Write a structure and sequence with these properties.
Chain A: GO terms for molecular function: transcription coactivator activity. Chain A: Keywords: Activator, Nucleus, Transcription, Transcription regulation. This is part of a larger assembly, with chains A (103 residues), B (94 residues), C (48 residues), D (188 residues) and E (122 residues). Chain A is mainly α. Chain A has five helices and no strands. Chain A has a single domain, classed as Arc Repressor Mutant, subunit A. Chain A is globular, with a radius of gyration of 15 Å. By secondary structure, chain D is an alpha+beta fold. Chain D contains six helices and four strands; from the N terminus they run H-H-H-H-E-E-E-E-H-H. A four-stranded antiparallel sheet of chain D has the order 1-2-3-4. Chain D is elongated.
Chain lengths: 103, 94, 48, 188, 122
């Protein structure tokens, strides 16, 4: 009824924009660790990942550009539950992407 | 184009298409799904045949349940993320 | 000029105490690893 | 705040293509770490006056009193040592923090005692925490001794000497030993 | 590979850089007392560059889709799908059509496996 009113000062046009615009910033394995603070993780943050599920669908899929985001998408699709959203996997995780970058 | 689904074989022209068969695959499976212990599972193999019988009889003839839609089904999993001793003291101490 | 000497020396004593408490607590944890089950509580207090 | 935390505006470096010499104090001037009554900044004010009269850095800097950020140890192409200081004379120096190029970050150098205290505190905290949600479960008795109550013990399940006048393995241990001897008994 | 005209471009703009490579031998090497042999190197470029150009023409000779009619080559793909899309489930239907018999036939192999076991122990 007034969930938009819950915002301290937001509402915003939102739309497709900053969504994908930050999805490419999700791509970085180095980005993984920072998410181990409070900004978002297993808390209410989990909802972000649970509503960003729409990308596999047609139209949204085209605007994907860096399947490393699709591999971080694999991370959420995988038990990020585990260390993937906890301890995994140091700078080597970037290498785990760099290999994907290598191939 | 169902061949686009068969382009997974083209993906197999682009990849090894997974290890597929493995005893280890049967080991994670020894952990995964009902039940456990491959010998005991073999004892359950007739019961597993019962599982293929009327156990799977459940089908589809009911309301679509719009409330379940859509990505919120994952939000229920988040509800699982929230709502769902000897050694252990020494363990956590370790 | 003495302060560097304070560094190498006093930190030698410090790293020594660390070398004590750490590896000795490895010995400790190993004592815990002796456990088929119950921990020796009084021994644990001795460890403390 | 001054430790291992992000503070990046990469596009500046994207323009610069990376650091050169005095330009490190440019992105550093963007940083909070940069001081306003630093000789770097009051003589930045000199750049807003004399402009030409600054030389490289250290000549105009250390000869003039106040806070400074002198360069001593380059580490191309990433780190560059740059210590904060306070000249009290054209000759005298009173050096402060070694600010350093952490690459798209620069930090104050931590005290050893800070992290040491962190270690001491966290360790003794582990001790005390070991004493927390663990202690007073082995309740003492002169007779029963320490006790370990359970809904079910299993799992598993200074006194006296003189008295009345398993081996869960069914001697299986020796049997296995014999298996070791016997596996190569034909072979040996 | 594909877009091999761009590979030819690799022998164009990059060869154009090779002209720049040819450029840097006369900066001051003359009166500062070989360049005469460097002229033979210029001959070597007269060989190399031009032959590379001939190679360019040779790959020009067989541009894929010589019909050059995407408007109709896509139609070719349409007919190709008129084949393939029909063949899709048809070829894979054979799988189940086979196993529906052959799985039970394999268990028949298991029954004569019973009898083989009977033969094992007279």
């Amino acid at each position: 009824e007034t969930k938009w009113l819950l915002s301290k000062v937001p509402d915003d046009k939102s739309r497709f924009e900053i969504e994908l615009e930050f999805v490419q910033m999700l791509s970085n394995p180095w980005y993984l660790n920072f998410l181990a603070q409070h900004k978002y993780f297993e808390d209410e943050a989990f909802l972000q990942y649970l509503e960003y599920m729409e990308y596999w669908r047609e139209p949204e899929y085209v605007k994907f550009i860096i399947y490393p985001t699709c591999l971080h998408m694999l991370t959420l699709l995988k038990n990020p539950q585990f260390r993937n959203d906890i301890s995994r996997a140091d700078l080597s995780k970037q290498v785990n992407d760099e290999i994907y970058y290598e191939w | 184009d169902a061949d686009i689904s068969s382009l997974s074989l083209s993906l197999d022209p682009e990849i090894i298409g997974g290890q597929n068969n493995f005893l280890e695959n049967n080991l994670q499976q020894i952990f995964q799904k009902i039940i456990q212990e491959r010998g005991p599972f073999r004892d359950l193999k007739e019961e597993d045949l019962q599982k293929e019988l009327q156990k799977e009889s459940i089908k589809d003839e009911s309301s679509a349940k719009s409330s379940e839609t859509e990505n919120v089904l994952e939000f229920a999993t988040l509800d699982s993320k929230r709502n769902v001793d000897s050694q252990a003291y020494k363990k956590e101490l370790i | 000029d003495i302060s560097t000497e304070k560094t190498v020396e006093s930190l030698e004593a410090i790293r020594h105490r660390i070398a004590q408490i750490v590896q000795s607590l490895t010995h400790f944890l190993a004592i815990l690893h002796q456990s088929e089950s119950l921990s020796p509580w009084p021994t644990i207090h001795k460890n403390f | 705040d001054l430790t291992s935390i992000q503070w990046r505006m990469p596009e500046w470096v994207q323009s610069m293509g990376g650091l050169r010499t005095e330009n490190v104090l440019e992105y550093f001037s963007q940083s909070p770490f940069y001081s306003h009554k630093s000789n770097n900044e009051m003589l930045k004010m000199q750049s807003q006056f004399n402009a030409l009269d600054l030389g490289d850095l250290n000549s105009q800097l250390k000869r003039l009193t106040g806070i400074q950020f002198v360069i001593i140890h380059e580490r191309p192409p990433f780190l560059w040592v740059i210590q904060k200081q306070n000249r009290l004379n054209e000759n005298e120096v009173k050096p402060l923090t070694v600010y350093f190029v952490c690459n798209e970050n620069i930090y104050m150098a931590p005290n050893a005692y800070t992290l040491l205290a962190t270690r001491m505190l966290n360790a003794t905290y582990c001790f005390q925490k070991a004493l927390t949600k663990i202690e007073k479960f082995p309740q003492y008795n002169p007779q029963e001794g320490y006790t370990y109550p359970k809904l079910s013990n299993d799992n598993l399940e200074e006194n006296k000497n003189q008295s009345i006048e398993p081996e869960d393995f069914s001697v299986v241990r020796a049997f296995m030993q014999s298996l070791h001897s016997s596996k190569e008994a034909p072979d040996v | 590979m594909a877009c091999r005209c761009t590979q030819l471009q690799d022998t164009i703009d990059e060869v154009a850089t090779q002209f720049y490579s040819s450029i840097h031998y006369l900066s001051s090497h003359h009166d500062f007392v070989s360049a005469e042999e460097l002229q033979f190197a210029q001959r070597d470029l007269a060989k190399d560059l031009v032959t590379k150009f001939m190679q360019i023409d040779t790959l020009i000779n067989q541009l894929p889709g010589i019909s050059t009619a995407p408007k109709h080559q896509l139609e070719k793909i349409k007919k190709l799908q008129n084949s393939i899309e029909e063949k899709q489930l048809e070829r894979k239907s054979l799988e189940s059509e086979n196993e529906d018999l052959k799985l039970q036939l394999a268990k028949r192999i298991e029954t004569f496996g019973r009898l083989s076991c009977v033969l094992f122990q007279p």
